[PDB]
Design a protein around this ligand. Structure first.
Ligand SMILES: *[C@@H]1O[C@H](CO)[C@@H](O)[C@H](O[C@@H]2OC[C@@H](O)[C@H](O)[C@H]2O)[C@H]1O
Ligand SMILES: *[C@@H]1O[C@H](CO)[C@@H](O)[C@H](O)[C@H]1O
Ligand SMILES: *[C@@H]1O[C@@H](C)[C@@H](O)[C@@H](O)[C@@H]1O
Ligand SMILES: [Ca+2]
Ligand SMILES: [Ca+2]
Ligand SMILES: [Ca+2]
Length: 118
């Protein structure tokens, strides 16, 4: 048998996989996110569709990241930002939290996006 893990100048496994010599061939212990007989395959962690609310899943090494639609947040984009948190309405306007925006319900006699015009 040839020791592919010892006689090699560089790792015969891909992606820093750990070479384990066997009789007639060799084995590769793959790090997280890699698969295949030589760890050559990058696992697509986005195949399970983890991102919610029409977010876009980007495949990463041993994981993923979600690009949220505007107005959403969280690991899976499962939360909605509350644009009313900053108290945008003035003149005692009531703030309604929408997706990626707020709406100020103004008391009669006031207009404007945040009820700033008497
Ligand atoms: C397939 O969908 C799952 C829904 O939650 C998701 O967990 C899976 O994600 C992975 O799990 C969480 C993250 O921390 C890991 O890095 C990732 O492998 C997804 O693949
Ligand atoms: C927080 O308040 C500001 C105005 O002060 C507004 O621009 C933001 O949209 C709101 O979320
Ligand atoms: C991925 O990103 C999200 C935010 C949406 O714009 C999708 O349409 C896109 O494919
Ligand atoms: Ca061998
Ligand atoms: Ca991946
Ligand atoms: Ca919102």
């Amino acid at each position: 048998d040839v020791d592919e893990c010892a006689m090699a100048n560089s790792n015969p496994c891909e992606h820093a996989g750990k070479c384990v010599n066997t009789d007639g061939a060799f084995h590769c212990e793959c790090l997280k996110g890699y698969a295949g007989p030589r760890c050559e395959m990058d696992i697509n962690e986005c195949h399970s569709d983890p991102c919610q609310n029409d977010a876009t899943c980007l495949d990463k090494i041993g994981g993923f990241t979600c690009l949220c639609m505007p107005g959403f947040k969280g690991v899976h984009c499962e939360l909605e930002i509350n644009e009313c948190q900053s108290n945008p309405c003035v003149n005692n306007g009531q703030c309604v939290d929408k997706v990626n925006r707020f709406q100020c319900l103004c008391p009669p006699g006031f207009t404007g996006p945040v009820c700033q015009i008497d």
